Amino acid sequence: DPKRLYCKNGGFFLRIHPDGRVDGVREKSDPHIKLQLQAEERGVVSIKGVCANRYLAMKEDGRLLASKCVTDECFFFERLESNNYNTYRSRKYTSWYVALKRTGQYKLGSKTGPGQKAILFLPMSAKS
């Protein structure tokens, strides 16, 4: 059920703090990297931090944060690209993707686009 989102750009797992803060971590042991990907509509998902009990949201300024409740900003188009990596594109801000920098900090949505390694993720099983 619970997955971990491994980013190709540095090998960071997307982390959601109980705080609402979003970042990346390389440690498989981190309790805040276990995510629940729920289908809404065919090919649309919401991303929940199991432990944080919050939903990933993208703001109109490209910020990444985690919300206590589900809003129009918590829906993403989940796509299996040619390379077998998944991309998560904001349903509201249709040009922006969830992305992580090779630093472990998230990348502003407004700076993302196709061809970038930052937007590539590999959903893995949460069995460390």
Domain harbouring 117, CATH code: 2.80.10.50
The boundaries of the domain holding residue 73 are 1-128
Query: Looking at the 3D structure of the chain, how many domains does it have?
Result: 1
Q: Resolution, rounded to a tenth of an Å? A: 2.5
User: Rounded to an integer, what distance in angstroms lies between the CA atom of residue 93 and that of residue 108?
Assistant: 12
Binding-site residue set for heparin: 9
Structure-solving method = X-ray
